[PDB]
Design a protein around this ligand. Structure first.
Ligand SMILES: [Mg+2]
Length: 147
């Protein structure tokens, strides 16, 4: 069981930015070299949301001071990879600074910041595509209500 954060940043230059929202994806060092948001396994006694924050720090080098958790969104994924059952819980979190320093560990070899459509294509897997699309939809609905 793993928990993570769908990390995004806002791109607020109106004529320029094709995508007002970009998602952070990390590419695995091993295996297929899958692309996912930052995530990590739970620890005994650890709250699921604290695991997601901790795993984001460990996998992407993003500290709690550099993020804001967006309340109201949570998505649990259940899938089979290499004939093993997998469960992952994601929350949404916005980075404070567009230029936040991404520091990878040995578990990942690259990162991309991508618009929703390109993030979906890289993520590839259908549950992860759904979760990113649903996260994007939630962010737009929230903006509308505050607007
Ligand atoms: Mg805790």
């Amino acid at each position: 069981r793993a928990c993570g954060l769908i990390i995004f940043r806002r791109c607020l230059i109106p004529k320029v930015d094709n995508n007002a929202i970009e998602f952070l994806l990390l590419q695995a060092s091993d295996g297929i070299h899958h692309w996912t948001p930052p995530k990590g396994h739970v620890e005994p006694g650890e709250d699921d949301l604290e695991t997601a924050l901790r795993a984001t720090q460990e996998e992407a080098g993003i500290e709690a001071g550099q993020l804001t958790i967006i309340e109201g969104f949570k998505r649990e994924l259940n899938y089979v990879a290499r004939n093993k059952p997998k469960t992952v819980i994601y929350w949404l979190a916005e980075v404070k600074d567009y230029d936040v320093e991404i520091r990878l560990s040995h578990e990942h070899q690259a990162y991309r910041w991508l618009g929703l459509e390109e993030a979906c294509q890289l993520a590839q897997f259908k549950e992860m595509k759904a979760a990113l699309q649903e996260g994007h939809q939630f962010l737009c609905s929230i903006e509308a209500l505050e607007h």
